[PDB]
Amino acid sequence: GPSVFLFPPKPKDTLMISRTPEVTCVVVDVSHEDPEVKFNWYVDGVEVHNAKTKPREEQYNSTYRVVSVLTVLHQDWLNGKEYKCKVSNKALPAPIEKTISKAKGQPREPQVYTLPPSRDELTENQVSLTCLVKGFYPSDIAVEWESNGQPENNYKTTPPVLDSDGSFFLYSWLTVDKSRWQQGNVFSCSVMHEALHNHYTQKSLSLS
């Protein structure tokens, strides 16, 4: 019969003011004979009516996929409000309910450390500037780099990794030509996370 999956907002969407955090209720394996899906959305048990339900779409496997999207308020998601999708369909014994919210565990803020290129790397034509983000919970986080007060767009960041103490770490890094580092330019690693003061911190990195 029909199955239901309930997805949380993307991390940047929860942490950035100009972005739209959304919870997504997806229903799959909907038959031809019982094609109609109904959604009811609840926020800490109160029903809301402004979600946006997409029309059913037949999939290559001859079943329907129906999707409902509820936009969540930034503050509500951060306060741990619970979002419940309820799906009704006649091929089901009872309506299926799924609930999602922010990770439950005690919040912990990131420690942010900047690491200069390895000595052995200095012999190359590009070097790596590293930023270690450590010990944060929940795993929702966003990292950016800047040079001389302006965005750097050529950096990469690992996904969060689960650590032994139950928190998360990641590494971000920026690769730059050796002359640029050698000159004494300043680079900065910026982190947005809910548990930081102002949900933001910045640490800097520069030739010694």
Ligand X SMILES: *[C@@H]1O[C@H](CO[C@@H]2O[C@@H](C)[C@@H](O)[C@@H](O)[C@@H]2O)[C@@H](O[C@@H]2O[C@H](CO)[C@@H](O[C@@H]3O[C@H](CO[C@H]4O[C@H](CO)[C@@H](O)[C@H](O)[C@@H]4O[C@@H]4O[C@H](CO)[C@@H](O)[C@H](O)[C@H]4NC(C)=O)[C@@H](O)[C@H](O[C@H]4O[C@H](CO)[C@@H](O)[C@H](O)[C@@H]4O[C@@H]4O[C@H](CO)[C@@H](O)[C@H](O)[C@H]4NC(C)=O)[C@@H]3O)[C@H](O)[C@H]2NC(C)=O)[C@H](O)[C@H]1NC(C)=O
Please list every residue in the chain followed by a chain break, i.e. its C lies more than 2.5 Å from the next written N: none
Under the criterion CB under 8 A, does residue 79 sit at the interface with a copy of itself? Answer: no
Evaluate whether 56 touches 34 at the Cβ level (below 8 Å): no
179 binds, among a copy of itself, ligand X, none (CB under 5 to 8 A by kind): none
Strand order across the 83-88 sheet:
46-48, 38-43, 83-88, 96-100
- Shortest Å, Cβ 200 to ligand X: 24
Task: Report the residue from 18, 164, 183, 198 that binds a copy of itself according to the rule CB under 8 A.
Answer: 164
5 binds, among ligand X, a copy of itself, none (CB under 5 to 8 A by kind): ligand X
- What are the two backbone dihedrals, phi and then psi, of residue 21, each rounded to the nearest 5 degrees? -80, 135
> Taking the CA of residue 185 as centre, how many other CA atoms within 13 Å lie in the half-sphere pointing to its CB?
17
- Shortest Å, Cβ 78 to a copy of itself: 26
- Shortest Å, Cβ 26 to ligand X: 5
d(C-alpha 190, C-alpha 202), whole Å: 4
128 binds, among ligand X, a copy of itself, none (CB under 5 to 8 A by kind): a copy of itself
Which of 101, 79, 105, 104 is closest to 165 using CA atoms? 105
# chain residues binding a copy of itself, by CB under 8 A = 26
- The interface region with a copy of itself, picked from 36-44, 83-91, 127-135, 139-147 by CB under 8 A, is 127-135
d(C-alpha 48, C-alpha 142), whole Å: 30
Give the three-class secondary structure for 190.
strand
Contact residues toward ligand X (CB under 6 A) are: 3, 5, 7, 24, 26, 28-29, 59-61, 63, 65
Under the criterion CB under 8 A, does residue 163 sit at the interface with a copy of itself? Answer: yes
- Sites of contact with a copy of itself (CB under 8 A): 111, 113-115, 117-118, 120-121, 128, 130, 132, 134, 154, 156-159, 161, 163-164, 169-171, 173, 175, 203
